[PDB]
């Protein structure tokens, strides 16, 4: 250690990227950083343990600190019970936090030049801007044993009304029903994040709803983005010769897949969850994606790797054979969460260190020296030898050994 | 005509894709077939004319004739109730059709050996098996006008207590809440569809959901295609050497875009919807597709173009300009439709030209004549110059006329 880093919170995750978080920290932070970390373990045992509880107090340090970086985490479903035999099916930590946070998830391939892509076309970067809040990850879902009804109803605060909606009568059998819910004032932030981001990057804005199917669901959407658009941002989109424009999901996935990029995607929850991985894999890979929560107040952000935990490459080194992870979104939540901290602390040791990095990591790759899944973009799968490739830790080592150097020059510099 | 078809559902529909929809008749189908075609008109005026009575009649009617071909058609919102001083903003009508006959929407890109690909690893078809019923489309959405509790409620008809459940109590401000729900039944046959569709086809099968989220609601899907396939389907599977999976939406559609094709994927509603899309664009282009609902039953059968109407384009055949719409899902909607209508009468001739329809209109494709959009395939939309393709009337006479030559010969 030796930048003084400060005040960081650090979120432990499972499986694969949990091998990969200990060595990004042995390897790559902590020989030249000094944090004052908060850690909260989320692998899901410890998450067990506390009854989930240690998932709302990362979010509430992350209000206090206003950093957080994030591990992968397991969701649990029925088979995950019985794996570690919890006690709940316990929900999404991500959920939890994103919910507490609330903001938008801006996400974005990291290209490196010598990378094909699935979609030649995309020659220009792809920002989603995920809303963070609501709608599936917060919706009460249950099985209907049997025949009934099923009814949501409004009850104003002030209880001067109730207001009845039959969603369904199942008369022969049962089945499932849920509800979910979404807030104004965060569609509110939601649309001003998008504004601004596609003026910050000088690029158009697309939002995407099914408001033909979810006429007042999605048709909410579309109106305060609308609204917010034509009295707050069309004089700036019009001078940056920019726009932004409402299209139907479907539609908007087959026009993204067709263009040539550089636009910002302004996606609901369970949309932004979804294209975020067809846009980081048409780019490539799922290792090569940033994830960065900003939320309303600019001040407090949460970085994380959007894939998941990378269970089959974990079952392969609980065997003890060979993995190559991609560990660069795990890194680039640490960089994109220390250089949010050094914006904060006026830092400029550590904003320096955390573009660095980020230099290294695209440096490494485009020199050569890669995991198996970005090798398999360069040749195909079916013809990547042994030798095309870095294991997980043989591609953590390079890194290391490539951010020494450059930090050692940038010592030898006139000071 | 002079081949006796039978019993046909037609659906007319609204904008570019109604253009194009009686060319296909005038010019590929009665010249050539006789029919009772039993016409009901769902453009946009006549199924506010008739408060979208229309729409749910021509669904009884597909379920009594047992094969249905419908034209793309608008489902308005705020903007289109004003276009056409509609009285309400009328359902779609698909979501309407889909769930008066269930089963599963069947989505396959239609390949031509000349049309590049978007995603180059797909050399194997991907086909999208798209629940038709429930989720989304039967949804009950609602503006939520300030502060309150919202609520779901499950009352048993057994008399037994009702069980309710907080969705969210609005603190500061309002917002939007919705119910949805599904049958087991339906999903039981949506599961069914979908594994012996694999088996026919001889490719694996994949069920994308969302459980570790929606525990109960996808986790019923996940749970009821488990139990029928060790129950059912899993040794025949093994016999050749298929599988059948589950896989987390975001993960399967990753896996999608990098593997070779070849499997069937199992979408609820709304997935199927996006990914369809997504799979249609990633083989060419969204006029290249077919979309077929296979009811439960397996003898009634609805075809479609999975695209809408094209909207952008009819402003141009509005303003008098030149437009190149590809026209082939239309005709395909056709030729499913009268192919399986040829295959519930026994009537090899019908069953003869249906395919040699399809076949005429990728062999002229496949021959250089093709609309601007697949020309953009082959040398991007930048480089296009008119010489390299046929506007949407060109087409249509070109197709025509091969189809003349094709039966003819055929004599
Ligand atoms: N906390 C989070 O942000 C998320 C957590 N999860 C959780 O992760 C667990 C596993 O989910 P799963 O559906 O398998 O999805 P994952 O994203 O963990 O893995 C799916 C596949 O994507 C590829 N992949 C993903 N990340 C990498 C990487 N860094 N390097 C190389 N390949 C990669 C691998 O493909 P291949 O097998 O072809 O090598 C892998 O098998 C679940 O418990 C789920 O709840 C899932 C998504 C997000
Ligand atoms: N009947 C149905 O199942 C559907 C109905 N609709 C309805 O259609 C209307 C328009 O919907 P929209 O979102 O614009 O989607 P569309 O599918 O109608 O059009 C979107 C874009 O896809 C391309 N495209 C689609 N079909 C063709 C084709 N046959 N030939 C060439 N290009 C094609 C065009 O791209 P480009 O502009 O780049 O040329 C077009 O602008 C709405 O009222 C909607 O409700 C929508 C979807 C399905
Ligand atoms: O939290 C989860 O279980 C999945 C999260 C996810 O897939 C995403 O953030 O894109
Ligand atoms: O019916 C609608 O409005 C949309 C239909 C659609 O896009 C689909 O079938 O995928
Ligand atoms: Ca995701
Ligand atoms: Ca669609
Ligand atoms: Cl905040
Ligand atoms: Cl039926």
Redesign the interface.
Known sequence: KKISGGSVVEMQGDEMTRIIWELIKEKLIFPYVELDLHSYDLGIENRDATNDQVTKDAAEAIKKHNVGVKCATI????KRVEEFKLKQ?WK?PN?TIRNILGGTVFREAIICKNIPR????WVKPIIIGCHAY?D??????????????????????DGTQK?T????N?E????????????????EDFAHSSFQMALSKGWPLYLST???????????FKDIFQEIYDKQYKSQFEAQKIWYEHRL???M??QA??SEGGFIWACKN??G??????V???YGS?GMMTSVLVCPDGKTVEAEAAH?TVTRHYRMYQKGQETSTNPIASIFAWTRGLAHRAKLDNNKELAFFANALEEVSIETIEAGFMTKDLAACIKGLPNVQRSDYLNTFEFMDKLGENLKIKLAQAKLLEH
């Open positions: 969701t649990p479903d029925e099916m999404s959920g699935l979609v030649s076309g609501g599936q990850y917060r919706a009460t879902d249950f099985v209907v044993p049997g025949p009934g009804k099923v009814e949501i109803t409004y009850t104003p605060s207001v909606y039959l969603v369904h199942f022969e059998g049962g089945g499932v029903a849920m509800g979910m819910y979404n807030q104004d004032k965060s569609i099914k408001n033909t199917i979810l006429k007042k669901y999605d048709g909410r999901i479907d539609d996935v087959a897949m067709k369970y949309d969850d979804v294209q975020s991985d067809f980081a894999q048409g799922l998941g």
